[PDB]
Design a protein around this ligand. Sequence first.
Ligand SMILES: *[C@@H]1O[C@H](CO)[C@@H](O[C@@H]2O[C@H](CO)[C@@H](O[C@H]3O[C@H](CO)[C@@H](O)[C@H](O[C@H]4O[C@H](CO)[C@@H](O)[C@H](O)[C@@H]4O)[C@@H]3O)[C@H](O)[C@H]2NC(C)=O)[C@H](O)[C@H]1NC(C)=O
Ligand SMILES: *[C@@H]1O[C@H](CO[C@H]2O[C@@H](C)[C@@H](O)[C@@H](O)[C@@H]2O)[C@@H](O[C@H]2O[C@H](CO)[C@@H](O)[C@H](O)[C@H]2NC(C)=O)[C@H](O)[C@H]1NC(C)=O
Ligand SMILES: *[C@@H]1O[C@H](CO)[C@@H](O)[C@H](O)[C@H]1NC(C)=O
Ligand code: NA
Ligand code: NA
Length: 259
Amino acid sequence: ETFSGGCLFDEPYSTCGYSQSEGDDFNWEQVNTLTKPTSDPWMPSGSFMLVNASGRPEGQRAHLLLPQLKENDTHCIDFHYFVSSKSNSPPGLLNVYVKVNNGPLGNPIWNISGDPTRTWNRAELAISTFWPNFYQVIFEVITSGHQGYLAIDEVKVLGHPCTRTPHFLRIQNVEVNAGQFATFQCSAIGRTVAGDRLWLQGIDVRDAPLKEIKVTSSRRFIASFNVVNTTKRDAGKYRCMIRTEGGVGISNYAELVVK
Ligand SMILES: *[C@@H]1O[C@H](CO)[C@@H](O[C@@H]2O[C@H](CO)[C@@H](O[C@H]3O[C@H](CO)[C@@H](O)[C@H](O[C@H]4O[C@H](CO)[C@@H](O)[C@H](O)[C@@H]4O)[C@@H]3O)[C@H](O)[C@H]2NC(C)=O)[C@H](O)[C@H]1NC(C)=O
Ligand SMILES: *[C@@H]1O[C@H](CO[C@H]2O[C@@H](C)[C@@H](O)[C@@H](O)[C@@H]2O)[C@@H](O[C@H]2O[C@H](CO)[C@@H](O)[C@H](O)[C@H]2NC(C)=O)[C@H](O)[C@H]1NC(C)=O
Ligand SMILES: *[C@@H]1O[C@H](CO)[C@@H](O)[C@H](O)[C@H]1NC(C)=O
Ligand code: NA
Ligand code: NA
């Protein structure tokens, strides 16, 4: 029993290999408004995972974890999400995390500050981590203190590149000596436009600046990030990150070596 990674929440979520945490503050609820309706104006319809934020203080955390995914083909994760609030004010933050090969949680690769618009919005994830390696998508709500709803009514894992996000190509470790720049060549397939934010995130390390985006064709660009005048207190793991109006794409972790 492997898992596609995805879930309509029509069956119990453990059917999809989704799980929760007992190490945090609560749990997501699983609802179906067709089988038990609700006259709550701020409630969405259908089958979904819900956070009810009523009588929850600020700071409270709750994780819905995807099965570990061990993909061969370049693929796409998209989820569909909903937020509502009685106040014109948000019920919580929603964060998406990726741990790769059982690693540290790291930072949210994608997040909304949860503005309560009671509509559904798509977001797609383009993760470059493949068999024999694996990763785990983790949905984390953190409550604002005000009442309302955050919901996810379906996650889909498709076997093709993401449409609204470029995806990165394997990026190799970088090795240099001392007082001299270290260049990361974040090479992608797809299109990038104005709004798009592009960045190299290093754990425990101040982020290298975007140095340039060099577009080679309608389907290929390289974003390059320069860590200048390098020392030992610079060495660690780096990753390519693109945020577009549609999703987030992330390369594998490249490592930095200093001689
Ligand atoms: C998001 O969180 C909110 C806080 O937990 C929920 O609001 C609560 O919703 C319930 C609705 O069931 C409401 O209280 C009802 O329950 C009482 C306790 O049993 C009861 O006295 C009333 O309901 C009915 O049940 C009794 C027998 O049990 C019968 O005598 C009657 O038939 C009676 O009508 C009562 O209305 C709360 O007022 C409300 N709590 C708060 C603090 O706001 C939301 O439901 C939840 N959203 C969803 C849809 O998940
Ligand atoms: C991702 O790809 C892995 C590649 O291994 C081989 O898979 C078979 C089908 C064949 O196409 C080979 O040429 C290919 O390299 C898959 O690994 C599995 O391969 C077998 C079929 O499941 C299986 O007997 C074997 O035990 C298994 N594991 C290994 C390490 O070889 C893997 O299944 C695949 N995952 C998916 C479904 O994406
Ligand atoms: C979370 O997302 C916002 C955009 O909503 C971004 O600018 C902010 O800095 C992000 N923080 C992270 C990366 O956790
Ligand atoms: Na939980
Ligand atoms: Na659903």
